[PDB]
Amino acid sequence: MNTVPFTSAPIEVTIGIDQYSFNVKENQPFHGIKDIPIGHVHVIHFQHADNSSMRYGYWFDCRMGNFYIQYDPKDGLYKMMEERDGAKFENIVHNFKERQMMVSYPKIDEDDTWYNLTEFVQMDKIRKIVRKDENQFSYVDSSMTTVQENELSDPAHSLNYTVINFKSREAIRPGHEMEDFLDKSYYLNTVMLQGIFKNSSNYFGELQFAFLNAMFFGNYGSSLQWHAMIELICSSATVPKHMLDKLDEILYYQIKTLPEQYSDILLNERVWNICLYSSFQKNSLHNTEKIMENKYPELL
């Protein structure tokens, strides 16, 4: 179990760790988060009490280094940083735990929610999306735009998601215009899964990473990307059975975890109705369709 210590908490802020969150008052004696499960990526994220604009945060993996948070009063935000001095870090953390100034990552033992949301999200793969190679952790916020969004403006601060575009030469083989547009199996299986992604696990990870940035930061381009990667599979007539089964599980937990009050902006009515009711895979998403109909029947 790993620890992300905080130097201090000078401004009132709501702190998230994965799907948990807690309020820290201005200059409250708070020095971090302890008992973080090893083996998963994690996101630690922030919304200032003053300016609910800009949710922001840090993707990280505690196996990749010792990380802490420190408020920067010039840039005005909580910054993740890496401590290279191992003995200095253990010494810092042990003192803060002795004085009990840390919140415990509160995992219930029956609960596989985080694993289920992150099964295929790696930290090294996450670095391909967020280019800032000098850090082992990745910064994301509400307003960052995607590579495809800039095509339609700062490239250093972009989300490099896989560009998916159903009306593109990449998606459409010359001479198969109708076939490829109505049955996207060629674009799923050859272009994306065999050409850019290699296996069906990498494909799922980008899709999962897209969802979590949408949910935690309200990042709109990530929401577009999630729905695109779902639609590409639902609109393919030929999808390996194992990928469909896994897809239904993936989506099931995404829908389960989504804040009830955010469904109106995070869920695309058109994509979901098409996927569940019209697409080739309309009968292949039993768990996802059951939870969507019981929890968000309005959308449908």
Partner 1 sequence: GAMNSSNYAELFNNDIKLFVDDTNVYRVTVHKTFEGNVATKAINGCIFTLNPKTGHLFLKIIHTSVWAGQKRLSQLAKWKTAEEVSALVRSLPKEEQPKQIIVTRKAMLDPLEVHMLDFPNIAIRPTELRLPFSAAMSIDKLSDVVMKATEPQMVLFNIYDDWLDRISSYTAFSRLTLLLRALKTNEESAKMILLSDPTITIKSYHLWPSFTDEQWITIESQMRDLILTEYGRKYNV
Give me the residues that bind partner 1 (CB under 8 A), please: 167-169, 172, 177-178, 181
Residue 234 binds which one of partner 1, ligand W6H, none, with CB within 5 to 8 A depending on kind?
A: none
* Contact assessment for residue 5 and residue 96, using Cβ atoms and an 8 Å cutoff: yes
Q: Least separation, in Å, of the C-beta of 67 and ligand W6H?
A: 19
Pick the binder of ligand W6H from 162, 219, 236, 284 (CB under 6 A).
162
When the beta carbons of 167 and 242 are compared against partner 1, the nearer one is 167
Q: How many residues comprise the chain?
A: 300
The torsion angles phi and psi of 110, rounded to 5 degrees, stand at -70, -15
**Which residue lies nearer to ligand W6H by CB, 6 or 253?**
253
Structure tokens given for 128? 């391909």
- Please state the φ and ψ torsions of residue 166, each to the nearest 5 degrees: -65, -20
Query: 103-104 and 32-36: which strand pairing?
Result: parallel
Residue number, 114 or 187, with CB nearest to partner 1: 187
CB of 169 to partner 1, least distance (A): 5
Helical ranges in the chain per DSSP H: 86-98, 113-118, 123-129, 147-150, 177-182, 185, 200-217, 220-234, 241-257, 263-266, 269-277, 286-295
Judged by CB under 6 A, the number of residues near ligand W6H is 15
Residues of span 215-274 touching ligand W6H by CB under 6 A: none
276 near 290, Cβ under 8 Å?
no
Q: For residues 12 and 89, what is the distance between their CA atoms, to the nearest angstrom?
A: 25
What minimum distance in Å lies between the beta carbon of 181 and partner 1? 5
Judged by CB under 6 A, does residue 141 bind ligand W6H?
A: no
> Shortest Cβ distance from residue 176 to partner 1 (Å)?
10
Task: List, in sequence order, every residue forming a beta bridge with 20; answer none if it has no partner.
Answer: 17
Residue 125 or 282 with smaller CB distance to ligand W6H: 125
Residues 6+ apart with CB under 8 A from 165: 148, 171
Q: Smallest distance from the beta carbon of 103 to partner 1, in angstroms?
A: 52
Q: Which of the listed partners (partner 1, ligand W6H, none) does 169 bind, with a CB threshold of 5 to 8 Å by partner kind? A: partner 1
Task: Give the 3-state DSSP-derived string for 72-141, with helices as H, strands as E and coil as C.
Answer: ECCCCEEEEEEECCHHHHHHHHHHHHHCCCCEECCCCCCCCHHHHHHCCCCHHHHHHHCCCCCCCCEEEE
18 in Cβ contact with 35 (< 8 Å): no
Q: Which does 125 bind (CB under 5 to 8 A by kind): partner 1, ligand W6H, none?
A: ligand W6H
Least spacing, CB of residue 59 vs ligand W6H, in Å: 9
Among 81, 101, 163, 196, binds ligand W6H (CB under 6 A): 196
For partner 1, which is the closer residue by CB, 39 or 174?
174
The contact pattern for ligand W6H, residues 93-132, with x = CB under 6 A and - = no contact, is: ---------------------------xxx--xx-xx---
Interacting partner of 205 out of ligand W6H, partner 1, none (Cβ under 5 to 8 A depending on kind):
ligand W6H
Tokens at 27, concatenated: 């200059």
Rounded to whole angstroms, how far apart are CA atoms 231 and 251?
A: 12
Binding residues (CB under 6 A) for ligand W6H: these are 120-122, 125-126, 128-129, 160, 162, 196-197, 202, 205-206, 209
